[PDB]
Design an enzyme around this catalytic site. Structure first.
Site, PDB file in Angstrom:
ATOM      1  N   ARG A   1       0.807  -1.193   0.000  1.00  0.00           N
ATOM      2  CA  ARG A   1       0.000   0.000   0.000  1.00  0.00           C
ATOM      3  C   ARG A   1       0.845   1.249   0.000  1.00  0.00           C
ATOM      4  NH1 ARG A   1      -0.657  -2.536   5.412  1.00  0.00           N
ATOM      5  NH2 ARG A   1       0.986  -1.512   6.614  1.00  0.00           N
TER       6      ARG A   1
ATOM      7  N   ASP B   1       5.757   7.440   1.644  1.00  0.00           N
ATOM      8  CA  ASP B   1       5.617   7.554   3.105  1.00  0.00           C
ATOM      9  C   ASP B   1       6.896   7.286   3.900  1.00  0.00           C
ATOM     10  OD1 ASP B   1       2.868   8.338   3.119  1.00  0.00           O
ATOM     11  OD2 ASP B   1       2.676   7.222   5.022  1.00  0.00           O
TER      12      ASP B   1
HETATM   13  C1  LIG Z   1       1.862  11.141  -3.542  1.00  0.00           C
HETATM   14  C2  LIG Z   1       1.238  10.518  -4.777  1.00  0.00           C
HETATM   15  C3  LIG Z   1      -0.023   9.921  -4.888  1.00  0.00           C
HETATM   16  C4  LIG Z   1      -0.173   9.487  -6.171  1.00  0.00           C
HETATM   17  N1  LIG Z   1      -1.231   8.826  -6.773  1.00  0.00           N
HETATM   18  C5  LIG Z   1      -2.412   8.520  -6.107  1.00  0.00           C
HETATM   19  N2  LIG Z   1      -2.580   8.815  -4.833  1.00  0.00           N
HETATM   20  C6  LIG Z   1      -3.715   8.527  -4.217  1.00  0.00           C
HETATM   21  N3  LIG Z   1      -3.819   8.845  -2.875  1.00  0.00           N
HETATM   22  C7  LIG Z   1      -2.799   8.275  -1.992  1.00  0.00           C
HETATM   23  C8  LIG Z   1      -2.810   8.967  -0.629  1.00  0.00           C
HETATM   24  C9  LIG Z   1      -1.393   9.125  -0.179  1.00  0.00           C
HETATM   25  C10 LIG Z   1      -1.027  10.077   0.776  1.00  0.00           C
HETATM   26  C11 LIG Z   1       0.322  10.174   1.117  1.00  0.00           C
HETATM   27  C12 LIG Z   1       1.243   9.301   0.511  1.00  0.00           C
HETATM   28  N4  LIG Z   1       0.840   8.402  -0.387  1.00  0.00           N
HETATM   29  C13 LIG Z   1      -0.427   8.286  -0.744  1.00  0.00           C
HETATM   30  N5  LIG Z   1      -4.726   7.932  -4.840  1.00  0.00           N
HETATM   31  C14 LIG Z   1      -4.643   7.608  -6.120  1.00  0.00           C
HETATM   32  C15 LIG Z   1      -3.471   7.897  -6.791  1.00  0.00           C
HETATM   33 BR1  LIG Z   1      -3.259   7.488  -8.636  1.00  0.00          BR
HETATM   34  N6  LIG Z   1       0.943   9.803  -6.823  1.00  0.00           N
HETATM   35  N7  LIG Z   1       1.801  10.445  -5.944  1.00  0.00           N
END
Ligand SMILES: Cc1cc(Nc2nc(NCCc3cccnc3)ncc2Br)[nH]n1
Ligand SMILES: Cc1cc(Nc2nc(NCCc3cccnc3)ncc2Br)[nH]n1
Lengths: 278, 271
Positions: A143, A157
């Site tokens: 994840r 992260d």
């Molecule tokens: C940082 C990033 C996220 C994406 N692509 C996507 N991200 C999300 N949400 C993830 C939430 C999150 C928060 C902090 C760190 N990682 C993830 N949803 C769909 C996509 Br596609 N690219 N770069």
């Protein structure tokens, strides 16, 4: 408040904010000079406390120290002045590795053995780098690995501010799974996080890749997990997974931390195995 | 039944012709190994079910019906067969076949060395045993590797088919029950078919433990979610789909033992 910092600072007007990604929002960055780049943007909610800002800032500052690598989510810029803090990081359009894998299960274009083994190589590379920059992840899982349009694995992260002395072990991932199932024992029972405990977690990540987004220990609650661990229980070998690769996860799950392989070693073995995997 | 049991000469063995021996296992009953003589001066090694000294009337009556169920069911190579009984002037002994190598779980686990065919053959045999039982109106309800015994000559024999609390364990039997049997207390030949699925999963994980660490309340959760265990390693996709077939939420869509025997026959010849 916030100290200015010209190495990273982007004008507010160079950033066109788009759909929420789940706050993390998709955006477009003009310049970075007449071209746009899709980026993701980390920001705070209205709800937010001073500790939350403190955490976002720490994260960004950590990203500054750790520098760039193909296989981590890089920092691209930041909006720090006359407004809400925007941390601009690389955008990864095909979501987290868990989803990406699950979606490519047979009944989308399926993944070969080479692709799965290649996935693991890239995460092991990202980890080698983070390790070499003295960084310990603490929550390595599918994840928290993302996939770009070009299918490139990107550890996410890794800069995160988390008071380990306050983990809610009974709390579930948004998808319903329990984070503790990725934790090395000594991290779990003793709160000792090392590169070694990350490797234990890489072990579980490998399992996830090769069961195509499988859930570790399904329906096993926390108290029972501790029992499985104390008994020295190890997960069964996935089907369509080779003994050599099953030995690897086992080796990552060595009880004695010093005897686990390092990421430097894992990167070498994966390099060798990708090359020979069909 | 308090003072004397009904005689049945067809099956009665004189006690002088039976020499009790090492205990084999204790239950809620007791089983001991014995040396029987003339089933006509041949010694047959046999297993002898009997009550323990703390049994009640009800416990005796259950042991009796179990014996009578075995009489009604009849002989088959892949079940534990009735050989005789001592019913008169003393404790009740129910003499059944001795299986020298214990239960299938242990047997498999002690051999982690069986070939791919040996394993399928094992499954074939179990399913025959079940087709037979099924053809005799007999529903097992706890079919699992632990209730399949194995003999000196490596034959599989279904035990406990004649028998008379979800938390009693050191595994949980609930992990073998069909959803309808678990939730709707419906018990059919097809609810045994589901258990046969989990037994196949035991076979090809060589004594594996299904859902290790998962307690009862979480298991209910999973079944509802339509959760199915993953294809073991060293298991063909067709063997695994037999398991999934067995694990259909609708009972009537499951294959029958008759179907399983015919399928497993085919696969044994082609492994
Ligand atoms: C940082 C990033 C996220 C994406 N692509 C996507 N991200 C999300 N949400 C993830 C939430 C999150 C928060 C902090 C760190 N990682 C993830 N949803 C769909 C996509 Br596609 N690219 N770069
Ligand atoms: C009926 C019988 C048992 C054996 N051999 C062995 N039996 C045990 N315990 C038997 C109790 C049992 C087991 C499964 C189902 N019902 C009752 N332990 C070791 C051996 Br060997 N032969 N014939």
């Amino acid at each position: 408040e916030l100290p200015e910092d010209p190495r990273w600072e982007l004008p507010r007007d160079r950033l066109v904010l788009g759909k929420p990604l789940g706050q993390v929002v998709l955006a477009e960055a003009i310049g970075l000079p007449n071209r746009v780049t899709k980026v993701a943007v980390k920001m705070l909610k209205s709800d937010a406390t001073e500790k939350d800002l403190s955490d976002l800032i720490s994260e960004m500052e950590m990203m500054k120290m750790i520098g760039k690598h193909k296989n981590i989510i890089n920092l691209l810029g930041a909006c720090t002045q006359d407004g809400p803090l925007y941390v601009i990081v690389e955008y990864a359009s095909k979501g987290n590795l868990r989803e990406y894998l699950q979606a490519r299960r047979p009944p989308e274009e399926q993944l070969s053995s080479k692709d799965l083994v290649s996935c693991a190589y890239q995460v092991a590379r990202g980890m080698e780098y983070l390790a070499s920059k003295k960084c310990i992840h603490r929550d390595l899982a599918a994840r928290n690995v993302l996939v770009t349009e070009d299918n490139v694995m990107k550890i996410a992260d890794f800069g995160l501010a988390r008071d380990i002395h306050h983990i809610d072990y009974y709390k579930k991932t948004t998808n319903g799974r329990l984070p503790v199932k990725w934790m090395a024992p000594e991290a779990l029972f003793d709160r000792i996080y090392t590169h070694q405990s990350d490797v234990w977690s890489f072990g579980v990540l490998l399992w996830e890749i090769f069961t195509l987004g499988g859930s570790p220990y399904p329906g096993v609650p926390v108290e029972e997990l501790f029992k499985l661990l104390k008994e020295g229980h190890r997960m069964d070998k996935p089907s369509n997974c080779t003994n050599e690769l099953y030995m690897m996860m086992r080796d990552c799950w060595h009880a004695v931390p010093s005897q686990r392989p390092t990421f430097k070693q894992l990167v070498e073995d994966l390099d060798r195995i990708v090359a020979l995997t069909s």
